[PDB]
Amino acid sequence: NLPEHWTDMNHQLFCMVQLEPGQSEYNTIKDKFTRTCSSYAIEKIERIQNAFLWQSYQVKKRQMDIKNDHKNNERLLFHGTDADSVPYVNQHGFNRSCAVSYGKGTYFAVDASYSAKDTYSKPDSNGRKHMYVVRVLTGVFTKGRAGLVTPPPKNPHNPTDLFDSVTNNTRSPKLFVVFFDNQAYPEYLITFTA
Amino acid sequence: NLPEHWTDMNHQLFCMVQLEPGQSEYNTIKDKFTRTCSSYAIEKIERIQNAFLWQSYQVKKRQMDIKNDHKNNERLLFHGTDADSVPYVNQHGFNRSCAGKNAVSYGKGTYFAVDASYSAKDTYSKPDSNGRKHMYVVRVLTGVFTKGRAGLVTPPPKNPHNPTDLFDSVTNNTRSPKLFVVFFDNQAYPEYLITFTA
Numbered sequence A: 001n002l003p004e005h006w007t008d009m010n011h012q013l014f015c016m017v018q019l020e021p022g023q024s025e026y027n028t029i030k031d032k033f034t035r036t037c038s039s040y041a042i043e044k045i046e047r048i049q050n051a052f053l054w055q056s057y058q059v060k061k062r063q064m065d066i067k068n069d070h071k072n073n074e075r076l077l078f079h080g081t082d083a084d085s086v087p088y089v090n091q092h093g094f095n096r097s098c099a100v101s102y103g104k105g106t107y108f109a110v111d112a113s114y115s116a117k118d119t120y121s122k123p124d125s126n127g128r129k130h131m132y133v134v135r136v137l138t139g140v141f142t143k144g145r146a147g148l149v150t151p152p153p154k155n156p157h158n159p160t161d162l163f164d165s166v167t168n169n170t171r172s173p174k175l176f177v178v179f180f181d182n183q184a185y186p187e188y189l190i191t192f193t194a
Numbered sequence B: 001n002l003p004e005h006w007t008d009m010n011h012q013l014f015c016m017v018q019l020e021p022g023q024s025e026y027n028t029i030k031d032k033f034t035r036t037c038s039s040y041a042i043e044k045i046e047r048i049q050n051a052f053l054w055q056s057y058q059v060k061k062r063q064m065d066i067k068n069d070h071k072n073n074e075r076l077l078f079h080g081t082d083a084d085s086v087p088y089v090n091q092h093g094f095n096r097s098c099a100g101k102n103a104v105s106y107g108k109g110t111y112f113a114v115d116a117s118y119s120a121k122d123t124y125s126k127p128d129s130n131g132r133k134h135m136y137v138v139r140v141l142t143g144v145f146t147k148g149r150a151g152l153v154t155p156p157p158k159n160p161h162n163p164t165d166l167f168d169s170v171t172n173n174t175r176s177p178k179l180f181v182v183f184f185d186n187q188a189y190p191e192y193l194i195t196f197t198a
Ligand SMILES: O=c1[nH][nH]c(=O)c2cc(OCCc3ccccc3F)ccc12
Pocket: A078, A079, A080, A081, A099, A100, A101, A102, A107, A108, A109, A114, A115, A116, A120, A175
């Protein structure tokens, strides 16, 4: 049941579809980035159309919607990576084993400026940096700490009912960590330069 | 969307169903077990009915069935563990971030065994305070596999030059696999828990 803003894929399950500048979908994502990265130069933005990844994600969302009894568990966040990992993320999404102050999961930033550090979006031979815009099932979150391998239990008297993610600051989060596969869908890849 | 032989759970999402000796369901797991673990005795075998783990697992199996070419992608394997992990694995399944280092390591992942005798070892199914040992019987999406190597954090690529086209799992020996290692959540479904003792 693939989102309707996706474009046809000739019966295939994976495409990276480059967005054309000045149409409304591109403008939205660029606005989100330029809010804190207006000083960088956007080379391209690509919509990630991965049927499998999407399917596992929507399963996890339907379950987190049921478990939390409401429907507001998703945030749009950013994630900068190195060029060598982009093929992997396109196809297989985010993976904590590849990645840790608030836990050993995957880190997603609220501000593009954070993902834009060269430590995260390392620039390649030709100078290019890479950053995803990510649907993340953050659901109910709590402050993290170093060494977590899964979020803390909501009530440590029912030790297996867990928060859905952790953050550096609960009242005003600026990063999120999720510890399970298919809790995050990589939705756009922004290719940009300093 | 759940198997039509599970017990009605009444819109619960999880329960454990103790099995009866004599029934084919119980007797086949015991045979499987005692085929290599004849000198341990089974206390009980519980069918794990966990709707969410099932749902995400069946989705991964569907995906591997589509991607591989009429491959028998699923195996029934064993997993010894300690009492303290049973609650977690029951509700949440297997989590590579939690897994032990295997005496012979073929990657950093969750390990499953062909032979119950392997899982039966004290280092996996640690006896709890009452002498009870615990072993899962697991549906594991082994897919297309290759010999692993200790440094692996994901299965290897089938071709170095296409790094994202991955083996689904890895094994200690391709010609006579006795263990498998899986590197992703929801690739193994914990279907029965064997409680056993010496
Ligand atoms: O955008 C990102 N891509 N990849 C990352 O690994 C990443 C990691 C990341 O850390 C935030 C957590 C943190 C804060 C302070 C000291 C140490 C820490 F770990 C933020 C953003 C990103």
